[PDB]
Write an enzyme that holds these catalytic residues in place. Structure first.
Site, PDB file in Angstrom:
ATOM      1  N   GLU A 104       0.839  -1.216   0.000  1.00 43.73           N
ATOM      2  CA  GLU A 104       0.000   0.000   0.000  1.00 43.73           C
ATOM      3  C   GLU A 104       0.869   1.259   0.000  1.00 43.73           C
ATOM      4  O   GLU A 104       1.961   1.265   0.564  1.00 43.73           O
ATOM      5  CB  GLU A 104      -0.932   0.034   1.216  1.00 43.73           C
ATOM      6  CG  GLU A 104      -2.355  -0.415   0.956  1.00 43.73           C
ATOM      7  CD  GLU A 104      -3.148   0.537   0.077  1.00 43.73           C
ATOM      8  OE1 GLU A 104      -4.385   0.430   0.093  1.00 43.73           O
ATOM      9  OE2 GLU A 104      -2.557   1.380  -0.637  1.00 43.73           O
ATOM     10  N   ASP A 105       0.377   2.322  -0.627  1.00 41.16           N
ATOM     11  CA  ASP A 105       1.136   3.563  -0.714  1.00 41.16           C
ATOM     12  C   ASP A 105       1.263   4.315   0.599  1.00 41.16           C
ATOM     13  O   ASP A 105       2.373   4.645   1.022  1.00 41.16           O
ATOM     14  CB  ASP A 105       0.549   4.480  -1.800  1.00 41.16           C
ATOM     15  CG  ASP A 105      -0.900   4.855  -1.549  1.00 41.16           C
ATOM     16  OD1 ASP A 105      -1.647   4.033  -0.975  1.00 41.16           O
ATOM     17  OD2 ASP A 105      -1.299   5.971  -1.953  1.00 41.16           O
ATOM     18  N   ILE A 106       0.141   4.589   1.255  1.00 38.16           N
ATOM     19  CA  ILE A 106       0.191   5.306   2.524  1.00 38.16           C
ATOM     20  C   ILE A 106      -1.014   4.986   3.401  1.00 38.16           C
ATOM     21  O   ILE A 106      -2.151   5.176   2.986  1.00 38.16           O
ATOM     22  CB  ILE A 106       0.287   6.849   2.296  1.00 38.16           C
ATOM     23  CG1 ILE A 106      -0.041   7.583   3.600  1.00 38.16           C
ATOM     24  CG2 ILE A 106      -0.631   7.289   1.171  1.00 38.16           C
ATOM     25  CD1 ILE A 106       0.166   9.066   3.527  1.00 38.16           C
ATOM     26  N   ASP A 108      -3.379   5.854   6.318  1.00 41.15           N
ATOM     27  CA  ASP A 108      -3.777   7.020   7.090  1.00 41.15           C
ATOM     28  C   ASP A 108      -4.777   6.609   8.174  1.00 41.15           C
ATOM     29  O   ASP A 108      -4.428   6.488   9.346  1.00 41.15           O
ATOM     30  CB  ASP A 108      -4.414   8.047   6.160  1.00 41.15           C
ATOM     31  CG  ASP A 108      -4.785   9.313   6.875  1.00 41.15           C
ATOM     32  OD1 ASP A 108      -5.132   9.223   8.067  1.00 41.15           O
ATOM     33  OD2 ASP A 108      -4.738  10.393   6.253  1.00 41.15           O
ATOM     34  N   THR A 109      -6.028   6.401   7.775  1.00 34.95           N
ATOM     35  CA  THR A 109      -7.066   5.982   8.717  1.00 34.95           C
ATOM     36  C   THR A 109      -7.033   4.458   8.828  1.00 34.95           C
ATOM     37  O   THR A 109      -7.593   3.884   9.765  1.00 34.95           O
ATOM     38  CB  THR A 109      -8.479   6.376   8.246  1.00 34.95           C
ATOM     39  OG1 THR A 109      -8.917   5.452   7.241  1.00 34.95           O
ATOM     40  CG2 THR A 109      -8.480   7.769   7.664  1.00 34.95           C
ATOM     41  N   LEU A 111      -8.581   2.406   7.116  1.00 32.62           N
ATOM     42  CA  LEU A 111      -9.828   1.778   6.723  1.00 32.62           C
ATOM     43  C   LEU A 111      -9.614   0.860   5.531  1.00 32.62           C
ATOM     44  O   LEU A 111     -10.199  -0.220   5.466  1.00 32.62           O
ATOM     45  CB  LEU A 111     -10.886   2.835   6.404  1.00 32.62           C
ATOM     46  CG  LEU A 111     -11.428   3.640   7.594  1.00 32.62           C
ATOM     47  CD1 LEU A 111     -12.381   4.751   7.127  1.00 32.62           C
ATOM     48  CD2 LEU A 111     -12.139   2.689   8.542  1.00 32.62           C
ATOM     49  N   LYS A 136       0.772   7.514   8.582  1.00 32.23           N
ATOM     50  CA  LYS A 136       0.383   8.760   9.220  1.00 32.23           C
ATOM     51  C   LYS A 136       0.029   8.602  10.682  1.00 32.23           C
ATOM     52  O   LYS A 136      -0.450   9.545  11.308  1.00 32.23           O
ATOM     53  CB  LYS A 136      -0.781   9.406   8.479  1.00 32.23           C
ATOM     54  CG  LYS A 136      -0.359  10.218   7.270  1.00 32.23           C
ATOM     55  CD  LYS A 136      -1.544  10.954   6.680  1.00 32.23           C
ATOM     56  CE  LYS A 136      -1.169  11.706   5.424  1.00 32.23           C
ATOM     57  NZ  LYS A 136      -2.370  12.291   4.786  1.00 32.23           N
ATOM     58  N   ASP A 164      -0.757  11.022  -4.974  1.00 28.79           N
ATOM     59  CA  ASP A 164      -1.377  12.023  -5.823  1.00 28.79           C
ATOM     60  C   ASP A 164      -2.381  12.987  -5.209  1.00 28.79           C
ATOM     61  O   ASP A 164      -2.728  12.947  -4.024  1.00 28.79           O
ATOM     62  CB  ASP A 164      -2.112  11.336  -6.962  1.00 28.79           C
ATOM     63  CG  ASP A 164      -3.394  10.693  -6.496  1.00 28.79           C
ATOM     64  OD1 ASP A 164      -4.210  11.364  -5.837  1.00 28.79           O
ATOM     65  OD2 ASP A 164      -3.614   9.503  -6.763  1.00 28.79           O
TER      66      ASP A 164
HETATM   67  O1  LIG Z   1      -1.735  12.570   1.885  1.00 28.00           O
HETATM   68  C1  LIG Z   1      -2.216  11.794   1.066  1.00 28.00           C
HETATM   69  N1  LIG Z   1      -1.976  11.995  -0.281  1.00 28.00           N
HETATM   70  C2  LIG Z   1      -2.442  11.192  -1.285  1.00 28.00           C
HETATM   71  N2  LIG Z   1      -3.179  10.109  -1.091  1.00 28.00           N
HETATM   72  C3  LIG Z   1      -3.427   9.894   0.214  1.00 28.00           C
HETATM   73  C4  LIG Z   1      -3.023  10.641   1.293  1.00 28.00           C
HETATM   74  N3  LIG Z   1      -3.502  10.093   2.473  1.00 28.00           N
HETATM   75  C5  LIG Z   1      -4.160   9.030   2.096  1.00 28.00           C
HETATM   76  N4  LIG Z   1      -4.144   8.845   0.740  1.00 28.00           N
HETATM   77  C6  LIG Z   1      -4.751   7.755  -0.021  1.00 28.00           C
HETATM   78  O2  LIG Z   1      -5.848   7.221   0.697  1.00 28.00           O
HETATM   79  C7  LIG Z   1      -5.821   5.777   0.593  1.00 28.00           C
HETATM   80  C8  LIG Z   1      -6.603   5.166   1.740  1.00 28.00           C
HETATM   81  O3  LIG Z   1      -6.126   5.646   2.997  1.00 28.00           O
HETATM   82  P1  LIG Z   1      -6.812   5.191   4.366  1.00 28.00           P
HETATM   83  O4  LIG Z   1      -8.076   4.466   4.030  1.00 28.00           O
HETATM   84  O5  LIG Z   1      -7.143   6.447   5.074  1.00 28.00           O
HETATM   85  O6  LIG Z   1      -5.823   4.263   4.993  1.00 28.00           O
HETATM   86  C9  LIG Z   1      -4.334   5.473   0.539  1.00 28.00           C
HETATM   87  O7  LIG Z   1      -4.084   4.207  -0.080  1.00 28.00           O
HETATM   88  C10 LIG Z   1      -3.807   6.596  -0.354  1.00 28.00           C
HETATM   89  O8  LIG Z   1      -3.924   6.283  -1.722  1.00 28.00           O
END
Ligand SMILES: O=c1[nH]cnc2c1ncn2[C@@H]1O[C@H](COP(=O)(O)O)[C@@H](O)[C@H]1O
Ligand SMILES: O=c1[nH]cnc2c1ncn2[C@@H]1O[C@H](COP(=O)(O)O)[C@@H](O)[C@H]1O
Lengths: 204, 194
Positions: A104-106, A108-109, A111, A136, A164
């Protein structure tokens, strides 16, 4: 010596990125050393989650080759409707009985990772782990930890190196933070064109 | 250099490849310079054809950033059916319309060119503002249909290469260099009775 008018700063440079990756790679090859990885029969399947991780995946596997770890490249695609949970493309082959590494790229939450993890985990893989270019930490909405982290970052909007913004800046060699300037000036013109309420359903 | 037991000889090395890509990136920038590529509104849409092009695509767009060319990454995935037409099954389509945009299809290799001609035609129908193709490798003699790319990174003889994205039995895609698989392996692996 790289500069981006649209960025407020620069978190990591191409070279800085290359180093940490080479590092975690080595750390990954060491954990699988006693698992008996093998080309063709027992490779470490890498589920590359398109599209944010395309760049990190390109480099990540190459680094893994440097440490002689046989891998199989898989590409899935997910999207949002929270959490990117709409599946648009699944793996090409089965993951059952294989060692899988979701790329996975990043997170954050979490989810998304949380969802993708349980999903494939129920497909009886020999073992399932996770590697993310960026963490994060202080953004989780659900408890989730990635086995391998390239770098931990503070809540901010990052772009470049595959990451992106409205499908822009993925090509940057460096990981920079989008200037809140552009974010606003940009969405204001996006959330506008979006509201082209063309619903000309004039039934009556 | 790197040693590859399963490889018979190396056709191009990372550095050798890194170079040819820069020159092609350069050319592309020169060609589209009079169009007016601008981020968001009118970028150079790259239709990366998974999966043989996952690694090529990754470097190519970075090299294109160097010559400051705005790009939009689209990842499409095709599958075979089990067709002398080249027809293939769409598993992943572009997320955004390519109509009125300048597109550049990024393929990994073009042997028979059946799939590529099919993809070209298809997207061609979608009224893009212009449509070109860039291929990492090219085998001009093995064409099963008339087709010529717009940017060939390197021409090669009808050998069976692997590495740098290209595979063999879904293996060796992670190699840093493009190498030729030695027969001994291609045969020892063909123990397809299990
Ligand atoms: O700062 C950011 N820049 C760009 N894409 C982000 C950023 N934060 C989260 N994402 C995207 O959000 C997706 C889902 O993140 P999550 O569900 O919050 O873990 C990640 O796979 C990223 O592609
Ligand atoms: O030498 C090769 N090694 C590995 N895959 C190849 C080779 N030549 C062609 N291919 C694959 O065959 C597909 C069909 O070829 P095309 O229709 O000419 O694009 C390509 O997209 C590649 O995935």
């Amino acid at each position: 010596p790289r500069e981006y008018e649209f960025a407020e700063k620069i978190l990591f440079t191409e070279e800085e990125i290359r180093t940490r990756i080479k590092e975690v790679a080595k750390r990954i090859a060491d954990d699988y050393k006693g698992k008996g990885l093998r080309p063709y029969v027992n490779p470490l399947v890498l589920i590359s989650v398109l599209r944010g991780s395309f760049m990190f995946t390109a480099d990540l596997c190459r680094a893994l080759c440097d440490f002689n770890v046989p891998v199989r490249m898989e590409f899935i695609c997910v999207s949002s409707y929270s959490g990117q949970v709409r599946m648009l493309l699944d793996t090409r082959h089965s993951i059952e009985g294989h060692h899988v590494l979701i790329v996975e790229d990043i997170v954050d939450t979490a989810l998304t990772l949380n969802y993708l993890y349980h999903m494939y985990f129920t497909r009886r893989p020999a073992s399932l782990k996770t590697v993310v270019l960026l963490d994060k930490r202080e953004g989780r909405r659900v408890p989730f930890s990635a086995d391998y982290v390239v770098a931990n970052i503070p809540n901010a909007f990052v772009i470049g190196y595959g990451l992106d913004y409205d499908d822009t800046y993925r090509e940057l060699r460096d990981i920079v933070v989008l200037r809140p300037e552009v974010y606003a000036e940009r969405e204001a013109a996006r959330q506008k064109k979006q509201r082209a309420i063309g619903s000309a359903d004039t039934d009556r």
